[PDB]
Design an enzyme around this catalytic site. Structure first.
Site, PDB file in Angstrom:
ATOM      1  N   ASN A 271       0.072  -7.004   4.043  1.00  0.00           N
ATOM      2  CA  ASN A 271      -0.108  -5.685   4.665  1.00  0.00           C
ATOM      3  C   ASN A 271      -1.601  -5.430   4.875  1.00  0.00           C
ATOM      4  O   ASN A 271      -2.364  -5.355   3.879  1.00  0.00           O
ATOM      5  CB  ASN A 271       0.471  -4.552   3.790  1.00  0.00           C
ATOM      6  CG  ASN A 271       0.466  -3.235   4.561  1.00  0.00           C
ATOM      7  OD1 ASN A 271       1.327  -3.044   5.441  1.00  0.00           O
ATOM      8  ND2 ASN A 271      -0.461  -2.328   4.282  1.00  0.00           N
ATOM      9  N   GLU A 272      -2.020  -5.234   6.121  1.00  0.00           N
ATOM     10  CA  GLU A 272      -3.431  -4.956   6.414  1.00  0.00           C
ATOM     11  C   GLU A 272      -4.394  -5.886   5.645  1.00  0.00           C
ATOM     12  O   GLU A 272      -5.277  -5.472   4.899  1.00  0.00           O
ATOM     13  CB  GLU A 272      -3.817  -3.486   6.166  1.00  0.00           C
ATOM     14  CG  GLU A 272      -3.085  -2.562   7.184  1.00  0.00           C
ATOM     15  CD  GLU A 272      -3.800  -1.203   7.384  1.00  0.00           C
ATOM     16  OE1 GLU A 272      -4.688  -0.824   6.599  1.00  0.00           O
ATOM     17  OE2 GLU A 272      -3.426  -0.475   8.362  1.00  0.00           O
TER      18      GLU A 272
ATOM     19  N   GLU B 282       1.565  -0.141  13.036  1.00  0.00           N
ATOM     20  CA  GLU B 282       1.573   1.243  12.472  1.00  0.00           C
ATOM     21  C   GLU B 282       0.673   2.090  13.337  1.00  0.00           C
ATOM     22  O   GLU B 282      -0.534   1.780  13.458  1.00  0.00           O
ATOM     23  CB  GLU B 282       0.992   1.286  11.059  1.00  0.00           C
ATOM     24  CG  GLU B 282       1.796   0.449  10.011  1.00  0.00           C
ATOM     25  CD  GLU B 282       1.106   0.472   8.685  1.00  0.00           C
ATOM     26  OE1 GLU B 282       0.379   1.470   8.410  1.00  0.00           O
ATOM     27  OE2 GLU B 282       1.276  -0.475   7.921  1.00  0.00           O
TER      28      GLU B 282
ATOM     29  N   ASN C 202       0.900  -1.199   0.000  1.00  0.00           N
ATOM     30  CA  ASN C 202       0.000   0.000   0.000  1.00  0.00           C
ATOM     31  C   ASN C 202       0.924   1.230   0.000  1.00  0.00           C
ATOM     32  O   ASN C 202       1.482   1.533  -1.065  1.00  0.00           O
ATOM     33  CB  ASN C 202      -1.042  -0.043   1.167  1.00  0.00           C
ATOM     34  CG  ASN C 202      -2.280   0.736   0.855  1.00  0.00           C
ATOM     35  OD1 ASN C 202      -2.987   0.417  -0.137  1.00  0.00           O
ATOM     36  ND2 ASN C 202      -2.543   1.824   1.669  1.00  0.00           N
TER      37      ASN C 202
END
Ligand SMILES: *[C@@H]1O[C@H](CO)[C@@H](O[C@@H]2O[C@H](CO)[C@@H](O[C@@H]3O[C@H](CO[C@H]4O[C@H](CO[C@H]5O[C@H](CO)[C@@H](O)[C@H](O)[C@@H]5O)[C@@H](O)[C@H](O[C@H]5O[C@H](CO)[C@@H](O)[C@H](O)[C@@H]5O)[C@@H]4O)[C@@H](O)[C@H](O[C@H]4O[C@H](CO)[C@@H](O)[C@H](O)[C@@H]4O[C@H]4O[C@H](CO)[C@@H](O)[C@H](O)[C@@H]4O[C@H]4O[C@H](CO)[C@@H](O)[C@H](O[C@H]5O[C@H](CO)[C@@H](O)[C@H](O)[C@H]5O)[C@@H]4O)[C@@H]3O)[C@H](O)[C@H]2NC(C)=O)[C@H](O)[C@H]1NC(C)=O
Ligand SMILES: *[C@@H]1O[C@H](CO)[C@@H](O[C@@H]2O[C@H](CO)[C@@H](O[C@@H]3O[C@H](CO[C@H]4O[C@H](CO)[C@@H](O)[C@H](O[C@H]5O[C@H](CO)[C@@H](O)[C@H](O)[C@@H]5O[C@H]5O[C@H](CO)[C@@H](O)[C@H](O)[C@@H]5O)[C@@H]4O)[C@@H](O)[C@H](O[C@H]4O[C@H](CO)[C@@H](O)[C@H](O)[C@@H]4O)[C@@H]3O)[C@H](O)[C@H]2NC(C)=O)[C@H](O)[C@H]1NC(C)=O
Ligand SMILES: *[C@@H]1O[C@H](CO)[C@@H](O[C@@H]2O[C@H](CO)[C@@H](O)[C@H](O)[C@H]2NC(C)=O)[C@H](O)[C@H]1NC(C)=O
Ligand SMILES: *[C@@H]1O[C@H](CO)[C@@H](O)[C@H](O)[C@H]1NC(C)=O
Ligand SMILES: *[C@@H]1O[C@H](CO)[C@@H](O)[C@H](O)[C@H]1NC(C)=O
Ligand SMILES: OC[C@H]1O[C@@H](O)[C@H](O)[C@@H](O)[C@H]1O
Length: 986
Positions: free
Chosen positions: A162-163, A261, A103
């Site tokens: 990622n996420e 994060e 991202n």
């Protein structure tokens, strides 16, 4: 998840352990691909280490490392090796986050544009997507495996994906076979450190106990104030997260509470507010309230995204952002650490790393009216039987800018006490939060309690030093259990200040009250010395660690409570070292100041700063006060308007003589792009032909059927793109763009045609990058660039065929500049020819006097729609050995001025996309290393005038920031290849 695979990095409910030592991981995000100057990574790591952080988290951008499918390349400015070496040299550990999907506000979210030719859904177990990732992960995970702490390198943790946190309607989620395949790729490449994930919210995806696809440590993210920086003073109701301790116990109680994060700034779109405004939203007040709120929940792996943002040079960013990725972070894009948020963050990092009791204290529910009589504050306790308690205090309305007076009633080893015990009220000013402590160990001493916050403490060979602070005009109190040992006669000694009061109880507990101000108070109690300062004074203290020995010397004696020297003063303290009988300090100074050294190692009698010995005054406590030379010079920069500018036409395509026989034919009758099915008879999507970067051009031949024909043209370039159209050499029109438009439908009349004659449409379509793919199942990264649809009709309505050629960067995925990477160049003529590279062939350009009819300067520009490229030699001769002098290029934005787009090049690196009618960016920093501060530079400005009246740059200047006298390691000039004539160019 089946436990640790090695015994170097392990974990339990409370924390990570590194080499068997419990530690609070406090990490900053840094993206190596956003700073292509290898010798400046250590500069960033020094600035992060000086916050008291121990770790850096980084992405790897796949699109830069495998621009041609099957050809992984991470050499030169794309090698991670100097990044790993710098982390080892600074004593920083690393969390590696290589994707494949990241991202990150980068083009494609990390996916190379050739994934647009992969039919299957991205981020699923469609086998064409899975196998398309195999070469990249095998290569990058094997590079990261060599850098693991098990092999003597800095990497301690690895994030897959990622996420991975939700999916589009009707798509399997969580797709556990998918998740496990992504884990297996990393395990198969030799990653044996723990795997940590970063769920977008506390959704439980991948947590231990969820079976297939589970990671080792469950992590999640949080950006509680969002990314719109329009109202930097507004902190809306319900913005503060209040459920994360419970959410953690519900989801993954067996592993450390991890925020992989947490907001350190915001991104900003084209047409946005500027990163100064983002830094005002995510400022020092945000850090003290929101970050201490995460400590209230017991966070022990905590990473701030971003800590240093850098720059989206060379088209590496996505359309939802622009060139700068300053992010409003604590460390600016130009690496300066002047923002107040930096200094505040240092207070927090320095506090956590001397406070091991925080790890084992149990966070409990937030309370109101329990630990204080006042209901106007909320207090969250972290409790332990004996090892000390912590109390996070905030306003009950977390947004409040009011001042509250209060007292607390706190449990201690001496019983519950209402504090201040010697009378008076504590103060919580607007948007502040504090941590008060009880039974806090300070080496062999104990603070029975303190309301003032701890900056640091250390037990030196002969004295223990404690530094406490409060905001100005706050009353504080603390109590020290009998500090005098056996002695009945020993008494407190006031060393500095006239405000501190001292009262001793019958059992020799010493209670001190003071009101914080610019005047330090200092009291000695036996061998304990307490320095009591205000917050603004504490901002200028530093705690460099003393090196150990051998390869890992920079990691010091331990991660928590390391051997250190305390230094009051300086804009940055980078490091200390002992050399015989000398203490040698590396420091940076942006203003004059003395330096006070507290805690001199035994047998040291000499001082050096930045390699220069100097004397010092010795205080009665044995501290050294030194006065290094600090000359801050006036800097003169060359005037850009006075360089010798050369010009070349960068739209030769529209001239009658132009030969396009070398251009790729746009003749693919089908596309594998499943997200945007073709509407046209051939694909006009750049990525279908290998062009993923920068501006595209299309050339459409047709034979006129009637004298007037109507053209419908649907173009797409990503947010804030633009597109211009010529018929032969006749300008037809432009879509001039705006922040909210990623595509446009344009209709044009093509009039006064000779029936039977052939005509060529030239269509230029900018791309501001490829979109992200943040929702699995929704293949948004596959949004194409180029022409989505068209119709050409005669005046009687008959359809008229167009046959097409296209180009992006010369060679496409066989891109020409291996050194600067696959995205740096787009498809404009001057880029394809290599005319943006150093030492361009000036015989192919024109030169003429500025403000004349034959001007070759961007300040005079062009008088018709079109595209020109300007280049000039910029010699610089600046004292870069002694000073860090940040440089930037500033465009003047003229309110009434025709629209234009420009590209900025410096020594062949594209370092700016300027969009005069969209903004917000006008100042384009370029780092030393890309710029040569003692040599010749080549600057390039492309000028694309969108309207028929032409355009010009109203003003363009080099700007310097105030010079910083520096103790950094020297910056080496990055040696990008010079222009060489390109074979097969067009
Ligand atoms: C040099 O100086 C120049 C000045 O001399 C300076 O020029 C000025 O630049 C400004 C900034 O670019 C320009 O302002 C913008 O103009 C935009 C274009 O406006 C025209 O077109 C729109 C839209 O038309 C379409 O849609 C309609 C359907 O509604 C339809 O009708 C149309 O046909 C077409 O389909 C029109 O609506 C406009 O009309 C209005 O205004 C005109 C005046 O021009 C009137 O005549 C009309 O009556 C009508 O009022 C106009 O024709 C426009 O899109 C911009 O709007 C935003 O900004 C204002 C707030 O200021 C806000 O009201 C609006 O809602 C938009 O808000 C978004 O953006 C802001 C800023 O980022 C956010 O705070 C906000 O929340 C919204 O964000 C969302 O949308 C963003 C896209 O718009 C998107 O980026 C964003 O994404 C990201 O952010 C969030 C976080 O925020 C993330 O969470 C998310 O993930 C992420 O994606 C988010 O989705 C704005 O008005 C100005 O015109 C121009 N001035 C001049 C005189 O030229 C130039 O910039 C400067 N150069 C340099 C280098 O500095
Ligand atoms: C060399 O490098 C050094 C760093 O080593 C640089 O120094 C930094 O410079 C920046 C830029 O100037 C400073 O940040 C800005 O600071 C100003 C000034 O305010 C600060 O200092 C004063 C004392 O002088 C304090 O009183 C301020 O604190 C009060 O106000 C703040 C709110 O601003 C509040 O949060 C505090 O709790 C405190 O409130 C208390 O007092 C007020 C009375 O005012 C009272 O009402 C309240 O009840 C409390 O009692 C503060 O620490 C500040 O105005 C700026 O903020 C504004 O802009 C930013 C956006 O940029 C917004 O985020 C913010 O919301 C404001 O709108 C900046 O924060 C920084 O402090 C300073 N750091 C150091 C260590 O000195 C030099 O600039 C460099 N020099 C060169 C040449 O390179
Ligand atoms: C919480 O406190 C904040 C900040 O002091 C209040 O914010 C104000 O809200 C009012 C009404 O919405 C606005 O007119 C002010 O301009 C706001 N000030 C700032 C600096 O943003 C907030 O209303 C309080 N919230 C609750 C729910 O009681
Ligand atoms: C589509 O995908 C296959 C790989 O399966 C490839 O061989 C073919 O060239 C692709 N076609 C297009 C039009 O991209
Ligand atoms: C362009 O027109 C088509 C219909 O031809 C529509 O589907 C599409 O949304 C339009 N695109 C834009 C950017 O307005
Ligand atoms: O700057 C916003 C950030 O948002 C997070 O959700 C994402 O994981 C990051 O890659 C970045 O996009």
């Amino acid at each position: 998840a089946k436990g640790p695979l090695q015994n170097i990095v392990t974990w339990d409910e409370h924390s990570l352990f590194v080499h068997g030592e419990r530690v609070v991981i406090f990490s900053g995000e840094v993206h190596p691909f956003r700073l292509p100057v290898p010798s400046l990574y250590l500069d960033v790591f020094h600035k992060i280490k000086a916050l008291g952080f121990n770790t850096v988290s980084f992405y790897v951008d796949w699109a830069l490392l495998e621009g041609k499918p099957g050809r992984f390349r991470a050499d030169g400015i794309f090698s991670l090796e100097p990044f790993f070496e710098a982390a080892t040299k600074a004593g920083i550990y690393l969390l590696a986050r290589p994707g494949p999907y990241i991202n990150a506000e980068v083009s494609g979210g990390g996916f190379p544009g050739w994934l647009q030719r992969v039919k299957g859904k991205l981020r699923t177990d469609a086998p064409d997507y899975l196998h398309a990732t195999d070469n990249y992960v095998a290569h990058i995970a094997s590079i990261i495996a060599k850098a693991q702490i098990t092999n003597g390198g800095p990497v301690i943790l690895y994030q897959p994906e990622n996420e991975y946190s939700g999916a589009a309607e009707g798509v399997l989620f969580p797709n556990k076979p998918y998740m496990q395949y992504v884990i297996d790729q990393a395990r198969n490449a030799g990653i044996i450190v723990p795997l940590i994930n970063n769920d977008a919210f506390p959704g439980g995806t991948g947590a231990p106990g969820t079976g297939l696809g589970s990671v080792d440590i469950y992590g999640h993210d949080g950006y509680p104030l969002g990314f719109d920086c329009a109202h930097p003073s507004a902190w809306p109701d319900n913005g503060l997260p209040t459920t994360w301790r419970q959410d953690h116990l519900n989801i993954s109680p067996s592993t450390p509470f991890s925020l992989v994060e947490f907001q350190g700034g915001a991104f900003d779109p084209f047409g946005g507010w500027g990163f100064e405004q983002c830094s005002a939203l995510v400022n020092h007040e945000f850090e003290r309230v929101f970050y201490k709120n995460n400590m209230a929940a017991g966070v022990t792996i905590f990473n701030i995204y971003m800590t240093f943002g850098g720059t989206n040079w060379g088209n590496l960013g996505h359309p939802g952002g622009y060139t700068s990725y300053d992010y409003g972070a604590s460390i600016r894009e130009d690496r300066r650490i002047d923002r107040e948020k930096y200094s505040e963050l240092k207070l927090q990092g320095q506090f956590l790393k001397v406070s091991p009791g925080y790890i084992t204290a149990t966070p409990e529910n937030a309370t109101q009216g329990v630990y204080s009589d006042s209901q106007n504050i909320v207090i969250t306790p972290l409790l332990a039987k004996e090892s000390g308690d912590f109390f996070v205090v905030r306003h009950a309305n977390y947004s409040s800018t009011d001042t509250a007076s209060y007292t607390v009633k706190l449990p201690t080893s001496a019983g519950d006490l209402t504090i201040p015990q010697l009378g008076g009220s504590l103060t919580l000013t607007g948007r502040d939060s504090k941590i008060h402590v009880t039974d806090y160990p300070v080496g062999k001493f104990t603070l029975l309690y303190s309301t003032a916050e701890i900056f640091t403490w250390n037990e030196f060979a002969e004295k223990t030093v404690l530094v406490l602070y409060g905001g100005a005009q706050e009353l504080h109190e603390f109590a020290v259990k009998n500090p005098f040992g056996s002695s009945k006669t020993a008494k407190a000694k006031k060393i500095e200040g006239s405000n501190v009061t001292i009262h001793t109880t019958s059992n020799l507990t010493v209670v001190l009250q003071w009101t914080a101000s610019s005047a330090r108070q200092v009291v000695q109690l036996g061998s304990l010395v307490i320095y009591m300062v205000d917050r603004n004074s504490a901002y200028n203290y530093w705690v460099p660690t003393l090196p150990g020995s051998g390869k890992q010397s920079a990691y010091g004696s331990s991660l928590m409570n390391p051997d250190s020297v305390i230094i009051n003063g300086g804009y940055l303290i980078r490091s200390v070292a002992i050399k015989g009988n000398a203490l040698s300090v590396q420091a940076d100074f942006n203003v004059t100041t003395p330096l006070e050294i507290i805690g001199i190692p035994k047998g040291i009698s000499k001082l050096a700063v930045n390699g220069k010995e100097l004397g010092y005054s010795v205080s009665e406590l044995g501290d050294w006060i030194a006065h290094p030379a600090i000359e801050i010079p006036h800097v003169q920069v060359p005037e850009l308007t006075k360089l010798k500018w050369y010009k070349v036409d960068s739209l030769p395509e529209i001239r009658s003589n132009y030969d396009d026989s070398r251009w790729p034919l746009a003749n693919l009758r089908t596309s594998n792009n499943t997200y945007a099915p073709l509407k046209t008879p051939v694909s006009l999507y750049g990525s279908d032909y290998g062009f993923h970067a920068g501006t595209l051009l299309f050339r459409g031949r047709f034979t006129a059927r009637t004298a007037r024909q109507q053209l419908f043209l649907s173009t797409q370039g990503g947010s804030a793109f633009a597109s211009s159209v010529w018929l032969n050499d006749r300008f037809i029109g432009s879509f001039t763009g705006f922040d909210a438009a990623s595509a446009a439908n344009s209709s044009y009349t093509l009039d006064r045609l000779v029936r039977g004659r052939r005509y060529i449409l030239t269509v230029v379509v900018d791309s501001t990058g490829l979109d992200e793919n943040w929702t699995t199942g929704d293949d948004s990264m596959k949004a194409p660039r180029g022409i989505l649809d068209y119709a050409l009709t005669s005046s009687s309505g008959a359809n008229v065929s167009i046959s097409w050629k296209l180009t992006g960067n010369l060679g496409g995925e066989d891109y020409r500049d291996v050194f600067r990477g696959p995205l740096n160049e787009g498809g404009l003529f001057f880029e394809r020819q290599g005319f943006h590279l150093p030492s361009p062939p000036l015989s192919d350009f024109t030169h003429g006097p500025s403000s004349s009819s034959s001007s070759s300067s961007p300040l005079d520009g062009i008088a018709h729609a079109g595209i020109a490229f300007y280049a000039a030699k910029l010699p610089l001769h600046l004292p870069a050995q002694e000073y860090d002098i940040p440089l930037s290029f500033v465009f003047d934005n003229a309110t009434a001025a025709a629209p234009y787009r420009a590209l900025l090049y410096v020594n062949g690196f594209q370092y700016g996309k300027y969009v005069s009618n969209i903004g917000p960016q006008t100042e384009f920093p370029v780092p030393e290393g890309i710029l040569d501060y003692n040599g010749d530079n080549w600057i390039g400005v492309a000028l694309w005038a969108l309207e028929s009246r032409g355009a010009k740059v109203p003003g363009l200047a080099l700007k310097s920031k105030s010079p910083i006298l520096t103790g950094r390691e020297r910056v080496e000039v990055v040696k990008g290849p010079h222009f060489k004539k390109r074979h097969g160019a067009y």
